[PDB]
Design a protein around this motif. Structure first.
Motif, PDB file in Angstrom:
ATOM      1  N   UNK A   1      44.230  32.830  40.721  1.00 23.57           N
ATOM      2  CA  UNK A   1      43.189  33.777  41.059  1.00 23.57           C
ATOM      3  C   UNK A   1      43.019  33.850  42.567  1.00 23.57           C
ATOM      4  N   UNK A   2      42.962  32.696  43.236  1.00 25.49           N
ATOM      5  CA  UNK A   2      42.606  32.700  44.648  1.00 25.49           C
ATOM      6  C   UNK A   2      43.769  33.194  45.500  1.00 25.49           C
ATOM      7  N   UNK A   3      44.987  32.710  45.235  1.00 25.68           N
ATOM      8  CA  UNK A   3      46.137  33.152  46.024  1.00 25.68           C
ATOM      9  C   UNK A   3      46.416  34.642  45.814  1.00 25.68           C
ATOM     10  N   UNK A   4      46.369  35.124  44.567  1.00 26.91           N
ATOM     11  CA  UNK A   4      46.667  36.542  44.360  1.00 26.91           C
ATOM     12  C   UNK A   4      45.571  37.434  44.936  1.00 26.91           C
ATOM     13  N   UNK A   5      44.311  36.994  44.878  1.00 27.42           N
ATOM     14  CA  UNK A   5      43.223  37.712  45.541  1.00 27.42           C
ATOM     15  C   UNK A   5      43.577  38.069  46.973  1.00 27.42           C
ATOM     16  N   UNK A   6      44.192  37.134  47.693  1.00 27.69           N
ATOM     17  CA  UNK A   6      44.403  37.289  49.125  1.00 27.69           C
ATOM     18  C   UNK A   6      45.856  37.561  49.489  1.00 27.69           C
ATOM     19  N   UNK A   7      46.649  38.082  48.557  1.00 30.69           N
ATOM     20  CA  UNK A   7      47.954  38.599  48.909  1.00 30.69           C
ATOM     21  C   UNK A   7      49.060  37.581  48.918  1.00 30.69           C
ATOM     22  N   UNK A   8      48.777  36.323  48.572  1.00 26.01           N
ATOM     23  CA  UNK A   8      49.706  35.214  48.786  1.00 26.01           C
ATOM     24  C   UNK A   8      50.549  34.969  47.532  1.00 26.01           C
ATOM     25  N   UNK A   9      51.273  36.017  47.123  1.00 24.67           N
ATOM     26  CA  UNK A   9      51.915  36.023  45.812  1.00 24.67           C
ATOM     27  C   UNK A   9      53.069  35.037  45.740  1.00 24.67           C
ATOM     28  N   UNK A  10      53.689  34.721  46.870  1.00 18.55           N
ATOM     29  CA  UNK A  10      54.786  33.781  46.892  1.00 18.55           C
ATOM     30  C   UNK A  10      54.401  32.314  46.909  1.00 18.55           C
ATOM     31  N   UNK A  11      53.124  31.980  46.769  1.00 17.27           N
ATOM     32  CA  UNK A  11      52.743  30.575  46.853  1.00 17.27           C
ATOM     33  C   UNK A  11      53.486  29.771  45.792  1.00 17.27           C
ATOM     34  N   UNK A  12      53.784  28.490  46.060  1.00 13.34           N
ATOM     35  CA  UNK A  12      54.501  27.684  45.068  1.00 13.34           C
ATOM     36  C   UNK A  12      53.594  27.292  43.920  1.00 13.34           C
ATOM     37  N   UNK A  13      53.860  27.816  42.721  1.00 13.76           N
ATOM     38  CA  UNK A  13      52.969  27.671  41.576  1.00 13.76           C
ATOM     39  C   UNK A  13      53.327  26.499  40.670  1.00 13.76           C
TER      40      UNK A  13
END
Ligand SMILES: Cc1ncc(COP(=O)(O)O)c(/C=N/[C@@H](CCCNC(=N)N)C(=O)O)c1O
Ligand SMILES: Cc1ncc(COP(=O)(O)O)c(/C=N/[C@@H](CCCNC(=N)N)C(=O)O)c1O
Lengths: 368, 368
Positions: free
Chosen positions: B60-72
């Motif tokens: 929720x938090x990473x996609x909110x702020x555009x950070x779609x490539x974060x390591x999940x």
């Protein structure tokens, strides 16, 4: 793998987690009423000065556990996100002027690792030496700090008042810092004599890390309370302020409410609940040849079980194949891990049924 | 006194606190609905594996702020009690192998104090050099880590995608760790391009500290999110696990819910609210002689006001006499504090009534 906390990660999402010592049993009815009022506590936390809430939470918690002489002046009690954060603050503070720390052995391993990671050399003090005789003048002149976990984790052993008194006096005579981690205080009334009266009267430099976390099932909402003598002579306040402005007022209010519930009978119920769960475990490993309980007198929320012919790592692997997650004990023996080779630790702050199931599995396992 | 946090303690129990940058405005209606359902979130936190709640909060938090490539992948994002705890973990993790850190100047002062406290030497990098040009080979080869706060605090300056890419490439080619503090990300859409995409493409060793605390008025219920490249080569996981097992699932659930409200429109409302409060401050002071705003394009929740003819700290004293608490800017210029003794910082994450009260005092003081 690298420490006890990494073993605990493996349990976190399993229903038969009997590994970490955090409180995960069901809430009592009184505790559930507190949870139901969270939006009321939120509003209170929005509207009152945090200092008043904090003062009320400290008073409720310290008085609950007989610590009447705690310094109530603001801000002699630093409220931290956790007692590990309090420990990081103390450790880094100690490294400003101390090179060596005498530390009770065994104890929870992050105490050793936070001290060591901050550059402090560790001298182990076995529990027999610590409780049974004065520390040697040789030891006390080679260290800047003596650190005691009481009640100890994992043994439950409580530093008695006469011995705390003599220890504080020896530390005063040498100018060494007496540090106590009293995270497990609430579980054992033998630890409810007034420790701050003893420390203040001995006149040593001292720090006490209290902890609200291990006692009630509050979903890890907790504070570590870093308490220090006026003359502590370490930069605990400066380093505290580098790390945080303070803790949530909602958590402080939750501590206040849970402490009052405890004072009104919750604490006695907790003691009865832990004793029930300890008996469940000991009855389940009844005869089981080779099995023994190293801490017959412990009243702590964690429990050690020893066995002949198996290592605790082997028992852990056999247990895990059944989705039961406990903790090997090697790493509590932070100076001599082989001392822990034939023990596992079990978490008692659990609903009895999952605990029962886990130890039935351990019984089967412990019979090849 | 000893750092900005100690100036911030003085305001903590005061009605006209415009000092610390924490979110203290009133809950929106959507947010109050979340708070009203805390007992439900509590029940969810008791029933579900923490890992599921955490993954959901992070997504929720990473996609909110555009950070779609974060390591999940579990374990790549380390949820910490606060970004300051994240910073302590990082500073200690650097101290074994790094002597010097290049650090943007100014920036918030506990970043410098946590690095220095853990034995690192600091090299200031002024914003215009950092944003405006490649760093020198001389600087990069003499330093083990480059640390950039973006959006910066107190300036609000955002590291543009092109510069981040070049900076990450330069750190890769010099074997330097690039560390970002992105706690103010949510306030400025200029910082919502995917930082993790460019960091991974450049292939430097990197760490990012995200923070949920400054965005929403959650009574300091928050997490710092410590994210690291697979080859980071530093003990961030080990020292993390020395400090904590994890954060409260209730806080994780809260983050997830506040992030969802923000995706539903709350983030736009927040940007509009902050813009309103900045407009209030700048209209209030537009005409005062000697008064300027060095960061005209800042979207941050903190605002710098510059003034000729008096020291930021003299202005601080006069405002205090009228029960208004801001911050003198000297200490943000952690390498050259006189660089800031003609500015104060104002906190904008406040209800508009007390902010307007506070800024009216300031106008009056700056007019007399
Ligand atoms: C004696 C003692 N003093 C402090 C603490 C810190 O408590 P905290 O976690 O900060 O709330 C503990 C916790 N022991 C837990 C595991 C904690 C999770 N792991 C880390 N914190 N690294 C256990 O025994 O399982 C303690 O026993
Ligand atoms: C860029 C940046 N990165 C991390 C943090 C830490 O955030 P945290 O407090 O851990 O949630 C801050 C803090 N910003 C606030 C509050 C200071 C409170 N004092 C301490 N934390 N010691 C401010 O500017 O006033 C930051 O600006």
């Amino acid at each position: 793998k690298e420490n006890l906390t990494q073993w605990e990660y493996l349990a976190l999402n399993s229903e038969l987690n009997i590994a970490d010592g955090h409180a995960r049993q069901a809430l009592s009815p009184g505790q559930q009423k507190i949870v139901n009022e969270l939006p009321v506590l939120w509003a209170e936390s929005e509207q009152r000065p945090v200092q008043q809430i904090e003062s009320e939470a400290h008073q409720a918690y310290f008085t609950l556990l007989g610590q009447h002489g705690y310094p109530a002046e603001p801000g002699r009690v630093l409220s931290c996100y956790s007692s590990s954060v309090s420990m990081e603050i103390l450790a880094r503070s100690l490294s400003a002027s101390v090179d060596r720390v005498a530390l009770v052995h065994p104890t929870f391993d992050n105490i050793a690792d936070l001290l060591r990671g901050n550059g402090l050399d560790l001298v182990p003090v076995e529990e027999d030496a610590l409780h049974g005789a004065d520390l040697s003048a040789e030891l006390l002149s080679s260290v800047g700090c003596v650190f005691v976990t009481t009640p100890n984790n994992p043994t439950g052993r409580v530093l008695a008042e006469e011995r705390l008194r003599r220890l504080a006096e020896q530390c005063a005579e040498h100018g060494t810092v007496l540090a106590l981690d009293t995270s497990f205080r609430g579980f054992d009334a033998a630890a409810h004599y007034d420790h701050y009266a003893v420390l203040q009267e001995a006149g040593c430099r001292w720090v006490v890390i209290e902890d609200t976390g291990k006692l009630w099932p509050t979903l890890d909402l907790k504070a570590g309370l870093l308490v220090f003598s006026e003359d502590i002579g370490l930069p605990v306040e400066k380093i505290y302020s580098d790390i945080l402005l303070g803790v949530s007022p909602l958590i402080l209010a939750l501590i206040r409410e849970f402490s009052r519930d405890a004072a009104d009978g919750g604490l006695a119920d907790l003691h009865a609940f832990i004793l029930h769960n300890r008996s469940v475990v000991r009855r389940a490993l009844a005869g089981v040849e080779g099995v023994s309980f190293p801490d017959p007198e412990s009243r702590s929320s964690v429990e050690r079980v020893a066995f002949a012919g198996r290592t605790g790592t082997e028992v852990w692997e056999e247990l895990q194949r059944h989705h039961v997650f406990a903790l090997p004990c090697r790493q509590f023996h932070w100076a001599e891990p082989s001392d822990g080779d034939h023990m596992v630790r079990i978490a008692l702050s659990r609903s009895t049924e999952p605990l029962e199931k886990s130890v039935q599995v351990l019984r089967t396992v412990l019979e090849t």
